[PDB]
Write a protein that binds this DNA or RNA. Sequence first.
DNA 1: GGGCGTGCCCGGGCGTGCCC
DNA 2: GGGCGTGCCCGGGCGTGCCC
Lengths: 200, 200, 200, 200
Amino acid sequence: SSSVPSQKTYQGSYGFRLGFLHSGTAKSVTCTYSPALNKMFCQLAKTCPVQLWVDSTPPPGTRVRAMAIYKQSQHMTEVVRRCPHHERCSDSDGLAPPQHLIRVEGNLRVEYLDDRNTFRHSVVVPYEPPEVGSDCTTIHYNYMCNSSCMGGMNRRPILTIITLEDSSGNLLGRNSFEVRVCACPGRDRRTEEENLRKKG
Amino acid sequence: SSSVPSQKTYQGSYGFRLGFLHSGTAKSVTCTYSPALNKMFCQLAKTCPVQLWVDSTPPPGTRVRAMAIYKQSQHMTEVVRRCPHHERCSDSDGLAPPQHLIRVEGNLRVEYLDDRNTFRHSVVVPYEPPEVGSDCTTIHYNYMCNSSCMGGMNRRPILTIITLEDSSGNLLGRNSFEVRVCACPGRDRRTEEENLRKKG
Amino acid sequence: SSSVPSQKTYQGSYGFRLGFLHSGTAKSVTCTYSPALNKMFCQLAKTCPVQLWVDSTPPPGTRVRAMAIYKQSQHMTEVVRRCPHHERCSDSDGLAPPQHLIRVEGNLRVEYLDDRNTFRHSVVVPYEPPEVGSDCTTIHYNYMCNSSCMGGMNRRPILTIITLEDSSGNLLGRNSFEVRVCACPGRDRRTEEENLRKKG
Amino acid sequence: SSSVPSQKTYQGSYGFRLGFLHSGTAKSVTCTYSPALNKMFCQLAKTCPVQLWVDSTPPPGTRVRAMAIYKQSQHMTEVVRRCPHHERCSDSDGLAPPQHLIRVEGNLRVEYLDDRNTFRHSVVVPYEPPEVGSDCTTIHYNYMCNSSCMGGMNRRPILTIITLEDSSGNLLGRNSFEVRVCACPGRDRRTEEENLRKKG
DNA sequence: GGGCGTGCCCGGGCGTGCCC
DNA sequence: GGGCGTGCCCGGGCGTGCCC
Ligand SMILES: [Zn+2]
Ligand SMILES: [Zn+2]
Ligand SMILES: [Zn+2]
Ligand SMILES: [Zn+2]
């Protein structure tokens, strides 16, 4: 009955977890991940590689959904949307609706969804197993507004929720991470990690 | 025959109690809870998360009702309503009647009720059990006037009464807490707790 | 073309000016006037005597209009109205519309007007010459909200504009004074006069 | 043939100049004017009083037009518009089109225009002579975006151009001033004046 | 990569109807 | 008449995209 999707980690019976590349903290690196904060820092529209790791092979027809929600209780019930400026920037790839924050690049089977009851946006691709000898699959996500965008996220932190779902709709696994989209991911990761150590 | 709902705690056979988040006492925090006073301090229209804890699973069709009453004997028999200024502010979410003080956000099955005999307002949502691994459910309430509003609460303290009711109308459990809606919940919580220690 | 009436003093060819009684500055005096501030301090709904002085007798059919405007440039274009709480208090004398801030008591020929283009309220009585041996006429005004009323004046200072008008509509004279309606006119007059001396 | 209106001062045969109120430089004053910079600093949507001074009375039917242009050569040819976020904020007064940056408040004869060839916006009111004894007329303007608004002014300075025009369209006079719309006009005026003194 | 923006967060303290 | 309320004003200082 809640209109807020759950963020609770559920690694589930398939041993589902996420992985992130090691990029560093150079000032304006395009994408970097803080394990201490479970938080991805990235630039607007840049590639954000997310690895999907499983211990057991999901069944055929499994899907991978990504959605954003506001992290703070005060904002959770508000749908995460692109700001009006970027919604009109005509920067679509021909498939993503202009209002969707999260896109997937490099996938011929991407689907963009708007929930008819909650109005929330999500992007789905088929789950594909790793190639022989590889331990994970990688999806390239893109975030199409800065966290600071006026009339959109407006400086509020978001979580991305990644769910592994079978074709019937059963939740097989769920993981999430915080996101800041910003001009200087390396600067901002280092600032937030230092504030955690000094004041957290 | 009384037109005043009971505030008596009834944890009942399901072991029903409330829980509140730890927010601190920063001057203008949006919502904070004092265990010593059993009192929530929050800002107008801001999210107030309330956790529902049970020891035994309620039956299907159970409902959660919230209602406000004035705390002091002198004012108990007066219906708690929004003040005339805020009633006309056209700030409805499309479901809550403009006169109702307490709203629920983020729930697709909210129902707003006016008692035909007492004229008192209440807001009801279905009870949903916690997700596996979680110990409680959380409802987001909003209070749509300040305690100080002239022509409404007019500086008088209120209690929020939360009842767990089966579909037939049986009371399964009841809990309550005092509320102050104010501009500076952290200041005011600290003032009230200090006055309790010094003069209570 | 402006929707804001002029406040410019125009003593005019009849030598029109206002006079006020000497009341003192006892804490909760019902009405008191500060010449230094050209400001009347009064309590809600209490009698405020205003004297009309002329050097030459106005023609028959002359009228006396009172209107309120906000003093600050930022608020001048907003119509001064009673707040929603007091508008519903059913405290009318049978003639004053419930939304009008300024009333006249003790006059059998009072007229309450709403301007069809600016929506502003005014109250009008016939001008009557002083009795033989007297130098002025007195009108008893009442202000039906406090300056602090939420959803009304909301702590903003107002001016009352008194105009002497002939029956044809010509402006014969205009005077104005600031008003604060408050619980403690004597306290507040003394505070404002001291602030003028110390910080003005 | 140019699509950029001229900003050249033309006090003209009527001796047309502008005047501004003395407000000070308190940090968040709603509006303040720097003579040294010929620059108004104001908050979003707040009243900005502008005085019109003439030496000779303009003919009947004279109009007062206000328009914004970007100050820097690099941006002059771009039409000044509200940003997409504020354009959708449904904050219209019922007359101003939602895309127009400059509004006039308190005038029953305001007209909002879009030039059919340059697409530029302007707002026009009738010229009214000062009341007897007064030396100027005052118009209340409002600026409906911050200078910093993303997708609108985007941190770029603008000029407001005020023209006095006869009913036939002849330019009788022209004046202009720079504008910054910001959260803290007093801070920002002081910063800009200090930078002028130290680095200009 | 260093450092300036600039809307907004933050705690100190003044209001002002009402309690005493 | 003395003095406590309590929403809001106020200046200090942190953001964060962008200039350099
Ligand atoms: Zn954006
Ligand atoms: Zn209220
Ligand atoms: Zn009132
Ligand atoms: Zn804008």
